[PDB]
Design a protein around this ligand. Structure first.
Ligand code: NI
Ligand code: NI
Length: 345
């Protein structure tokens, strides 16, 4: 596998992990709890949750909604440099094959060397995005841990409903595993997104005191995996409602609090997955850099036509791969997101 062959896999994988974070962020923004008749503990839950939602709005103000715009533009710049220089490079390779010439050799070497400029920008833009993502993630995790600790204190004090609190927490933890199984399973291009809302502590006339959000997304359509995820989450919620039948609505509100962490926790997961995908992508981009450095070095040292054409297999293989990368990256950069919203009650 060459570097460019690997990048055919590694580049959509990183954009794949990025789109998920948009959906997790959207799940946070759409999570809501109303005070109702609650007393004493509500103010801090509301404060903690508002603190997490503020961090998402700050993150989105960067403009990196479905993916890093700077990483995408550096990919496109590499691909366009290949596309724009193909004929001049192939012309020189051909001429040099027939008769070695020092000036044309220096010319062809300068053309390959122009590939290294958008490659440096890509590697630098990956590090700058990863650094900002990791800084933000640590703040999200701190805020998640504050809200979690608030909820644990409230719940451990409601000694008369610990049976129903445990049965509900059990279902919430199953929903987390089902979300994780979906993401495992998905690991014609576009951006396809489903946002979920989970209704808890309902009112007889309609509505509820809690709306817990989460979201998933992918760059190829996967309507079947989404449906299985939705049926699993529905069945978990139906189980929660069955197990809370013996509680008042005010007790339902307390027993359901950890659903507020569902989408916050997914933000933590998704940030981590992007970073791992970017470590992997960084390694492959440096492997492309070092292939170009080896061609530049071999061209600089070549004395005859034979030395020169040995470097043309690297070039033509990379050109063709990069024209496929161009089409995928442009499709994804041009895509209008296709969003569907699912209420689970
Ligand atoms: Ni208290
Ligand atoms: Ni039962």
């Amino acid at each position: 596998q060459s570097a460019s062959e690997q990048l055919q896999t590694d580049i959509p994988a990183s954009i794949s992990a990025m789109v998920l974070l948009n959906s997790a962020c959207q799940g946070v923004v759409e999570t809501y709890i109303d005070q109702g008749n609650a007393e004493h503990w509500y103010a801090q839950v509301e404060q903690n949750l508002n603190a997490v939602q503020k961090l998402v709005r700050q993150w989105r103000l960067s403009g990196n909604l479905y993916f890093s715009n700077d990483i995408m533009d550096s990919v496109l710049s590499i691909a366009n440099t290949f596309k724009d220089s193909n004929v001049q490079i192939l012309t020189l390779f051909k001429a040099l094959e027939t008769r070695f010439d020092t000036a044309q050799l220096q010319q062809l070497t300068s053309l390959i060397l122009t590939l290294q400029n958008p490659i440096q920008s890509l590697t630098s833009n990956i590090k700058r995005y990863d650094e900002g993502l990791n800084a933000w993630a640590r703040q999200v995790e701190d805020a998640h841990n504050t809200l979690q600790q608030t909820i644990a204190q409230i719940q451990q004090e409601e000694v008369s409903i610990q049976a129903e609190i445990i049965a509900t927490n059990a279902q919430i933890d199953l929903m987390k595993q089902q979300i994780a199984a979906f993401k495992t399973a998905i690991a014609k291009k576009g951006i396809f997104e489903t946002i979920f809302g989970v209704v808890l502590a309902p009112f007889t006339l309609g509505g509820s005191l809690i709306l817990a959000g989460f979201g998933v997304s992918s760059i190829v359509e996967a309507q079947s995996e989404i449906s299985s995820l939705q049926s699993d989450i529905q069945s978990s919620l139906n189980t929660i409602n069955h197990d809370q039948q013996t509680l008042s609505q005010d007790q339902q509100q307390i027993a359901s609090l950890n659903a507020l962490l569902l989408s916050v926790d997914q933000v933590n997961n998704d940030c981590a997955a992007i970073s791992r995908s970017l470590d992997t992508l960084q390694t492959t981009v440096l492997s492309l850099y070092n292939e170009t450095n080896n061609v530049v070095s071999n061209l600089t040292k070549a004395q005859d036509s034979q030395a020169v054409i040995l470097e043309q297999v690297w070039y033509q293989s990379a050109y063709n791969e990069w024209q496929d990368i161009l089409e995928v990256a442009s499709t994804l950069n041009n895509a209008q997101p296709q969003i569907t919203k699912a209420q689970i009650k």
